[PDB]
Amino acid sequence: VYNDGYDDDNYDYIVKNGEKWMDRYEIDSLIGKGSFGQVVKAYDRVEQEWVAIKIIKNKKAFLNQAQIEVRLLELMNKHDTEMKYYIVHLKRHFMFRNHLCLVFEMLSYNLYDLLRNTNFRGVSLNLTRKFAQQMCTALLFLATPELSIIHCDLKPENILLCNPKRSAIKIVDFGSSCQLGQRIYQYIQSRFYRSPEVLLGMPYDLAIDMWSLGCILVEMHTGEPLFSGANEVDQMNKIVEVLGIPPAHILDQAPKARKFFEKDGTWNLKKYKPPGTRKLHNILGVETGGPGGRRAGESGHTVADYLKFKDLILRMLDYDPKTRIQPYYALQHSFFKK
Numbered sequence: 497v498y499n500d501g502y503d504d505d506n507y508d509y510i511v512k513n514g515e516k517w518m519d520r521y522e523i524d525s526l527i528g529k530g531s532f533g534q535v536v537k538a539y540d541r542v543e544q545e546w547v548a549i550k551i552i553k554n555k556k557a558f559l560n561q562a563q564i565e566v567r568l569l570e571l572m573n574k575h576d577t578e579m580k581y582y583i584v585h586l587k588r589h590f591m592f593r594n595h596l597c598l599v600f601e602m603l604s605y606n607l608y609d610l611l612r613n614t615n616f617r618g619v620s621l622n623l624t625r626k627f628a629q630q631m632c633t634a635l636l637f638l639a640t641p642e643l644s645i646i647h648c649d650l651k652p653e654n655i656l657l658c659n660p661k662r663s664a665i666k667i668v669d670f671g672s673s674c675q676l677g678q679r680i681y682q683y684i685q686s687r688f689y690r691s692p693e694v695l696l697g698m699p700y701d702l703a704i705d706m707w708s709l710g711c712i713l714v715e716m717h718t719g720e721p722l723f724s725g726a727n728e729v730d731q732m733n734k735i736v737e738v739l740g741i742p743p744a745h746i747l748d749q750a751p752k753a754r755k756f757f758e759k760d761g762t763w764n765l766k767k768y769k770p771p772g773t774r775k776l777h778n779i780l781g782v783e784t785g786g787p788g789g790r791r792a793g794e795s796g797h798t799v800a801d802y803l804k805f806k807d808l809i810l811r812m813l814d815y816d817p818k819t820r821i822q823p824y825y826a827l828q829h830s831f832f833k834k
């Protein structure tokens with residue numbers, strides 16, 4: 497027996513269809529799950545609307561992760577009462593049967609689910625642009641000084657559609673996030689989306705989220721991860737295939753340079769395609785009909801369009817976090833509509 501019979505051996509609440517909580521919520525069904533716990537669809541009888549309830553595991557490490565998340569969501573929703581900056585809206589929270597519960601507006605599928613729905617062939621350049629404009633607007637909001645929030649775990653699974661039929665999105669999952677200032681986490685970001693400064697053990701800031709976004713947008717259009725490393729050494733080598741050896745002024749200051757490289761004064765890889773020869777121009781199919789040639793003869797996919805997309809992505813994937821494009825200027829780029 498766990499939690500007087502209410503929990504399973506994984507620290508999760510055992511969902512019961514139709515259960516009533518607190519003379520208020522009627523639980524309907526499970527709609528999502530993850531490391532944190534579970535997400536259920538429930539009817540809020542007081543506000544007369546469907547809600548999603550994120551039920552955190554009954555275990556101290558998971559509870560405390562979610563307490564950080566609640567504080568950051570309360571700070572954000574407070575500075576965006578009109579809900580125009582593409583962050584999920586936390587309505588309220590409570591403790592129930594030894595689980596912290598977060599009540600949200602109900603959302604649809606995540607962007608990984610959308611990629612599966614394309615048979616891993618990618619969404620159109622027009623839909624990629626709509627997702628990009630919303631994501632850059634969210635990053636602009638997180639960079640406002642009273643917030644200064646680094647999400648730290650951007651990936652397709654943490655971006656949800658509002659509606660299955662439409663392009664509107666919201667960002668979720670602030671459990672691993674932090675605020676600019678004191679360096680606390682040195683181990684951060686899911687591996688495929690992890691920035692070079694984190695791989696190299698260097699100082700970091702909000703620019704790590706822009707790196708992740710560049711990786712995500714390429715994957716949304718091609719159907720597959722840009723840099724799919726099996727471990728940190730493989731990850732750095734896959735980055736170098738596309739982007740070349742990082743600049744010497746960065747490696748000369750990197751605590752973990754010698755995990756990957758050796759030092760003419762110039763740096764090279766430790767003993768893949770030669771550095772910089774796996775061109776983004778060819779991954780995107782700029783001149784050859786898009787990914788897999790499958791966009792040949794479709795509207796919305798011209799050479800000029802692809803050159804603008806490539807230009808923006810290369811600015812998001814700058815090795816130097818001081819010169820990598822920032823949200824304000826990404827929004828002004830000619831890839832976006834006037």
Ligand SMILES: CNc1nccc(-c2cnn3ncccc23)n1
Binds near residue numbers: 528550
């Ligand atoms: C699944 N539907 C759904 N609808 C609304 C909100 C959420 C959600 C909020 N935070 N998180 N964190 C992680 C995963 C999902 C979620 N989810």
